Amino acid sequence: KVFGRCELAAAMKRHGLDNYRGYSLGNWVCAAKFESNFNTQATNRNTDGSTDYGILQINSRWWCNDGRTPGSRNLCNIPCSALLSSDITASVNCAKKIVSDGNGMNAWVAWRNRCKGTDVQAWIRGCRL
Ligand SMILES: [Cl-]
Ligand SMILES: [Cl-]
Ligand SMILES: [Cl-]
Ligand code: NA
Ligand code: NA
Ligand SMILES: [Ru+3]
Structure with missing residues (x-):
């Protein structure tokens, strides 16, 4: 499934990611x-x-x-295939473990290189959340 931007923000917020470990949506x-x-x-x-x-x-x-x-x-005790579902539960619950491992979101190299220190609020701007 290809999510829309606000659609994924809403799904992530519903699954408890917004401000998880201090990282805003x-x-x-x-x-x-x-x-x-x-x-x-x-x-x-x-x-x-x-x-x-x-x-x-x-x-x-x-x-x-x-x-x-x-x-x-x-x-995360899951088959990697569970991470490809239209239901993002497995991806979110596993990401909670990853981001809690010590290095925060730096675990995602692309986050460090392309999101860290930027106006990330733009990614949720306009979304009904
Ligand atoms: Cl293996
Ligand atoms: Cl990168
Ligand atoms: Cl934000
Ligand atoms: Na493995
Ligand atoms: Na869901
Ligand atoms: Ru580790």
Whole structure:
């Protein structure tokens, strides 16, 4: 599913991401924009052989099981395929664990490079929330 900008903001807010660990809703929408262009079905293979899944491009090296990432963990206790659902519950609940791991949203390199320090409120501007 490809979400609209405000549609995804609303879904993320409903699932408890707004200001989760102090990160405002615009940060999460901005990260989703540059990780996946709001497409729940996005996948991308990493040079180390792991794969990133879903709206927030969550990596199989640590967070989900895909059966093809040797030596990896599954810290969210989910098949990586669950991260591709039209229902963002699995992606949100796993992102809560990721952002709580110590480095905040810097875990998402694209957030650090393209959202951090920017006017992220623009990503939720105009949305009925
Ligand atoms: Cl915001
Ligand atoms: Cl594996
Ligand atoms: Cl980047
Ligand atoms: Na894994
Ligand atoms: Na939902
Ligand atoms: Ru860690």
